[PDB]
């Protein structure tokens with residue numbers, strides 16, 4: 001059937017849709033379709049191109065209220081070289097004193113960042129197990145364990161200057177802790193002389209792996 005209304009969604013509304021590139025873009029909801037128990041949402045992107053999307057691949061074009069964001073909530077967030085995209089992830093932390101009132105996001109590709117409320121958008125129809133549409137099995141299983149074990153979160157305590165081994169492309173590299181920010185650590189890879197922010201509970205940090 002063709003619907004005009006479905007839950008709080010209405011045909012003609014502005015919305016965000018996931019493109020094939022895996023980045024999210026503004027568009028208009030032009031149709032809602034049912035096929036038995038299933039629902040699909042037709043989006044016309046601002047470039048005139050159209051996709052027929054599952055409800056976990058559209059997001060509201062507003063910032064979620066804080067009382068609607070939980071650990072494990074499925075969101076689209078602002079993602080950082082010198083460019084900014086909108087990319088899907090999972091809420092890992094909500095605002096508290098220790099994180100300076102920010103949200104910790106674990107993005108689907110394995111990146112992590114702190115963001116503000118104004119950098120988040122809620123996915124319209126998240127899966128019951130919100131991690132189940134994370135493409136990479138290793139990423140997906142990590143999130144399942146993290147979200148379900150929460151608030152039990154083993155983490156390594158690290159200090160600036162500390163020498164550790166950090167994983168990259170499947171092997172261990174000599175690295176140094178450059179700075180710490182809440183549950184994230186900035187690691188300098190010593191051979192390459194570039195940095196990455198990594199979650200302190202990541203098994204990419206050799207002390208966590210052990």
Ligand SMILES: Cc1nnc2n1-c1ccccc1COC2
Pocket residue numbers: 106107108109110111112138139140142143199201202203204
């Ligand atoms: C693996 C892994 N180790 N620490 C993290 N992850 C992860 C899994 C899935 C999505 C995002 C991340 C990155 O931040 C959290």
